[PDB]
Design a protein around this ligand. Structure first.
Ligand SMILES: CCCCCC(=O)N[C@@H](CCO)C(=O)O
Ligand SMILES: [Zn+2]
Ligand SMILES: [Zn+2]
Length: 250
């Protein structure tokens, strides 16, 4: 069985130093990177992958002033980029969603999680437990009373929607392998590779455990050899130019 439609939905942007996309680069040039969420229309109902940035980021590029990442990360988020507003424009309210899938709990991927207080939020155990104590996690991304559906390892959410455990960039990062009616096999690496060169050329990039990130890239490459999917990376300015985005779908 296949997903009916896979939508790429812009959810604001984020400035990062270029050394975060290629660890060999000299710090000092910021890159204005895309932030994405994905909407899957399935037989069982709509599924949202990631939830954008927290409300604290709205019109607040200096959000991380005074923290260990001051000047390194600057969110570019307007009121329109709040996930609830994105969803309402698309045609949904939070309680309409079948599942939320959190690729991981970094601030640009889980900042909107608090909006979903009934929908099960599928997240890896190792990610959830990291978010409880590691300093790179915002409180907005680990709210205590949401309906978490904690999983361990690879997982089938519904037919056509597979989660691949790809730790390294974060302790419980997961990627998506989706089968769509229009396109067949699609791999969303999410932050298992920010850019094409992180994936193809194994160019190192920001992560909790680069050695583990590399092993997850090698694992994805084995999947790619078998399945020959179309592949989309987490924060790739070049690829963004050619991506079909909402209202188009793949
Ligand atoms: C563990 C190394 C990654 C740092 C934390 C972070 O939130 N990174 C953002 C960078 C801005 O997009 C992300 O996940 O995308
Ligand atoms: Zn991340
Ligand atoms: Zn990211």
């Amino acid at each position: 069985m296949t997903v009916k439609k896979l939508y790429f939905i812009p959810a604001g942007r984020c400035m990062l130093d270029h050394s975060s996309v290629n660890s060999a680069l000299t710090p000092g040039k910021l890159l204005n990177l895309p932030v994405w969420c994905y909407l899957l229309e399935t037989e069982e109902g709509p599924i949202l992958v990631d939830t954008g940035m927290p409300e604290s980021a709205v019109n607040n590029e200096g959000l991380f002033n005074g923290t260990f990442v001051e000047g390194q990360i600057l969110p570019k988020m307007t009121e329109e980029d709040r996930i609830v507003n994105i969803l309402k424009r698309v045609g949904y309210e939070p309680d309409d969603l079948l599942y939320i899938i959190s690729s991981h709990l970094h601030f640009d991927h889980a900042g909107g999680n608090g909006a979903f207080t009934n929908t099960p939020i599928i997240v890896q155990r190792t990610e959830y437990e990291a978010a409880l104590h590691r300093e790179e996690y915002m409180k907005e991304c680990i709210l205590p009373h949401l309906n978490y559906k904690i999983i361990e390892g690879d997982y089938e959410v519904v037919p056509g929607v597979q989660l691949l455990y790809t730790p390294g960039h974060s302790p419980g990062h997961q990627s998506l392998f989706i089968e769509t009616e229009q396109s067949g096999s699609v791999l969303l690496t999410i932050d298992a590779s920010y850019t094409k060169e992180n994936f193809e050329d194994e160019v190192p990039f920001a992560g909790f455990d680069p050695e583990l990130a590399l092993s997850s890239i090698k694992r994805l490459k084995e999947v790619v050899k078998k399945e020959k999917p179309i592949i989309f990376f987490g924060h790739d300015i070049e690829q963004e130019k050619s991506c079909r985005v909402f209202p188009e779908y793949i």
